Design a binder for these strands. Structure first.
Ligand SMILES: [Mg+2]
Ligand code: NA
Ligand SMILES: [Zn+2]
Ligand SMILES: [Zn+2]
Ligand SMILES: [Zn+2]
Ligand SMILES: [Zn+2]
Lengths: 162, 162
DNA sequence: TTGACTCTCTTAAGAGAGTCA
DNA sequence: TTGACTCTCTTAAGAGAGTCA
């Protein structure tokens, strides 16, 4: 269907539009007790969002372009990756926010990986705290830490060994 | 059921039945290049599972007892925690497998924590690799590692900064 | 061709409840 | 009373597709 040039044109129009989103400076934990700064390009909270953009869920959006009278639509964060393989190890590739900020559409804050890899970044100690992700995290995951476990392993009798 | 005595009786009956499940030894990564051994008490693959147990999904079971002439039923892994708060910080408490082995019902392999804490153990480096969980992991999470990211952050133009 | 809404679905860690015998 | 099945739901990281003007 769409040629390489046409896909590049979609990516370029998406970048043009997203680059005009409000740029918000966020101070973030990097791990190892260090703090860094990320600059997120945030889609607006309500319509209008930007040329080509529309909200399909509370924190879900799509990008739409009509080419040769055919409507094409993509998940709003998938556009930077339209020239990449869409699966790996038999798993669908997903847009994964390195900044953990759903509204952000900065392509420098996104990677393209399995949903498991994507989720796992929530708990990563971060680039200065021991991140082993080959595509390195930009920050410590928001859920990293000791947790809030209510009750640990226990037995009343003696039927079990660890 | 309602009374503490009745709850303790439920926990004791559950422990006695699960204590008769086959004990399967699993050698597991601990992190730091070290290996450990866990003894999982595994519910059978097919009926009969044990007194009070029935399968409600491919890897879901429930425990049921008749008390006060009424049937009381619980998720099969929730029984050790019947005297614990059922929520934390406004999040539902869940039975969480420290051994990452769904069929296992060894209460020494279970904790009671939010679904986020539960999920996050999948990526933990483990008790000899840097686990910071206050209720410590028994093994390195099965999904720990560098990942298989297909594409990293990138832009075609010059509109974005990290 | 475009905007602003609408709907349902996927995954993998977890749940509750009803139908029969 | 107990067993063995059936169904749908929750969450938070992610998706595709329809309607109307
Ligand atoms: Mg778990
Ligand atoms: Na993510
Ligand atoms: Zn961002
Ligand atoms: Zn990382
Ligand atoms: Zn186990
Ligand atoms: Zn841990």
């Amino acid at each position: 269907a769409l040629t390489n040039a046409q896909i590049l044109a979609v990516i370029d129009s998406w970048e043009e539009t997203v680059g005009q989103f409000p740029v918000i400076t966020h101070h973030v934990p990097l791990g190892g007790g260090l703090q860094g700064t990320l600059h997120c390009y945030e889609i607006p909270l309500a319509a209008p969002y930007g040329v080509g953009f529309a909200k399909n869920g509370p924190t879900r959006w799509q990008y739409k372009r009509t080419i040769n009278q055919v409507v094409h639509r993509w998940g709003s964060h998938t556009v930077p990756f339209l020239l990449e393989p869409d699966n790996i190890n038999g798993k669908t590739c997903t847009a994964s926010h390195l900044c953990h900020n759903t509204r952000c559409h900065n392509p420098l804050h996104l990677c393209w990986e399995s949903l498991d890899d994507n989720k796992g970044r929530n708990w990563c100690p971060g680039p200065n705290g021991g991140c082993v992700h080959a595509v390195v995290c930009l920050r410590q995951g928001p859920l990293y830490g000791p947790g809030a476990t209510v009750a640990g392993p226990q037995q009343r009798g003696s039927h079990f060994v660890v």
